Design a protein around this ligand. Structure first.
Ligand SMILES: CC(C)c1c(-c2ccccc2)nn2c(C#N)cnc2c1O
Ligand SMILES: [Mn+2]
Ligand SMILES: [Mn+2]
Ligand SMILES: [Zn+2]
Ligand SMILES: [Zn+2]
Length: 454
């Protein structure tokens, strides 16, 4: 038996409300942050054109076992076209139920998914596609052949997910480090029972997902305030998932029945996303789900000004866990401060507040390491090092504001929380390597204040 969670909020914005996605997301946040996920139905005549040759789009499929609480890797040998994948997917579903595909009720697919993942005797395996856009398989939205007027109409829409990162209200917008995972949309080609395991987004970002066409995508979501409650339940039932991971390519995730979370007082919400609808996930909101049949979705991460303090909290949380970072949060803040004259004024005001916290934290850490006997110092342009050359030996954080080095261990660095973890030499042999003096930093913050105060 399966008891479906309550439905998540559904929004139907007018065209006036829809025109600015960031204003709309800010508006619905008091409701939707209490449920973790929400669904958005665009105005009826917002219909971006979907056109592709199913024989020229192709991709390498991933394969997936469907066992509850079994470890799966979040990021991982033949090849499908969009046509031959669809032929396999449709035959799979109609053979599984002995019915035509658009006659299998969504409630029955959901009930059967939770039965099959729970029984050991069933050995069902399925396949799917997942990758960023490429010449072999591009975005489902229009991008800059000669375009039709209809395609040109949607090139610069705020809800064209290619544009979402680069708009003037995103802060991930101007990370200069190429981070393919956080500005570039992912494309998901689904079949019946293919499933995304429970997760949150890197650096606790938002995400937004559009179903271009096909059968529905079923979601489960948990509000950000219950994240640690969910993690405690999973640690108790699946401890193998919580061992320390060697790389960011070795993150373990799993399938888990939402009734198990609800039994343990974790709030969970559900929805069926149909073609032409968006789903939005909020910072630190856990989510999972599965595809009802052959379909095609596109999704991207993004960060608003609301998110900025949560981003700083996330990197602190990563430090406690010795988890790798995708980018340096402080590097992003300082990059924006160096471009204060071109920032949105509301963005400038919010970045200024986070910068003030950063500067006071850095002042206190530098005083502590001076009292430990580190005397020598030198400026160091951390942004020029490859990421894997500026991680703290102990906690793996990506350094940018400062670090400690010692000529006895050439090339190694610790962050200023881990001065005692670098080597056995006494601290007077160490050097403080810093990006900025405090005297460089206060004028940078003042530029943001001037930009914000007009
Ligand atoms: C099942 C898969 C095709 C898939 C995956 C996904 C992809 C690669 C690795 C891990 C998960 N993720 N996903 C989301 C999210 N979040 C929304 N929808 C889907 C989806 O359909
Ligand atoms: Mn199974
Ligand atoms: Mn996700
Ligand atoms: Zn450290
Ligand atoms: Zn040493």
């Amino acid at each position: 038996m399966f008891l479906p969670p309550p439905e998540c909020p559904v929004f139907e914005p007018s065209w006036e409300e829809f025109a600015d996605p960031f204003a709309f997301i800010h508006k619905i946040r008091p409701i939707a942050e209490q449920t973790g996920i929400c669904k958005v139905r665009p105005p009826p005549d917002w219909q971006p054109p979907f056109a592709c040759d199913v024989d020229k789009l192709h991709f390498t499929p991933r394969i997936q076992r469907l066992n509850e609480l079994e470890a799966q890797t979040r990021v991982k040998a033949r090849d499908y076209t969009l046509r031959t994948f669809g032929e396999m997917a449709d035959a799979f579903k109609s053979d599984y139920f002995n019915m035509p595909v658009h006659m299998v009720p969504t409630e029955l697919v959901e009930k059967e998914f939770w039965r099959l993942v729970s029984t050991i005797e069933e050995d069902v395996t399925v396949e799917y596609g997942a990758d960023i856009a490429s010449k072999e398989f591009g975005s489902g939205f229009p991008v800059r052949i000669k375009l039709s007027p209809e395609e040109e109409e949607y090139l610069d829409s705020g809800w064209n997910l290619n544009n979402m990162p680069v708009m003037e209200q995103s802060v991930l917008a101007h990370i200069t480090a190429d981070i393919c995972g956080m500005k570039l949309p992912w494309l998901y080609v689904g079949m019946c029972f293919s499933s995304f395991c429970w997760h949150i987004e890197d650096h606790w970002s938002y995400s937004i997902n559009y179903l271009h066409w096909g059968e529905p995508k079923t979601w489960y979501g948990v509000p950000g305030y219950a994240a640690e409650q969910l993690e405690n339940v999973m640690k108790k039932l699946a401890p193998e998932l919580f061992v320390s991971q060697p790389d960011l390519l070795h993150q373990l995730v799993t399938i888990m029945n939402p009734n198990t979370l609800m039994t343990h007082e974790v709030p969970v919400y559900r929805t069926n996303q149909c073609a032409g609808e968006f789903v939005i996930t909020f910072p630190r909101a856990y989510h999972s789900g599965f595809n009802q049949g052959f379909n095609f979705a596109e999704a991207v991460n993004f960060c608003t000004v609301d998110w900025l303090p949560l981003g700083r909290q996330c990197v602190e949380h990563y430090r406690l866990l010795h988890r790798y970072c995708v980018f340096s949060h402080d590097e992003m803040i300082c990059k924006m401060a160096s471009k204060a004259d071109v920032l949105d004024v509301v963005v400038a005001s919010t970045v200024q507040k986070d910068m003030a916290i950063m500067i006071e934290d850095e002042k206190a850490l530098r005083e502590t390491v001076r009292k430990l006997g580190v005397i020598d110092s030198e400026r160091m342009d951390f942004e020029l090092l490859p990421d894997d050359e500026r991680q703290c030996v102990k906690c793996k954080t990506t350094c940018f504001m400062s670090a400690i080095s010692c000529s006895c261990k050439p090339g190694l660095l610790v962050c200023l929380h881990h001065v005692k973890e670098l080597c056995s030499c006494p601290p007077y042999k160490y050097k403080l390597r810093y990006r900025y003096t405090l005297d460089d930093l206060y004028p940078m913050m003042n530029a943001l204040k001037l930009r914000a105060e007009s």
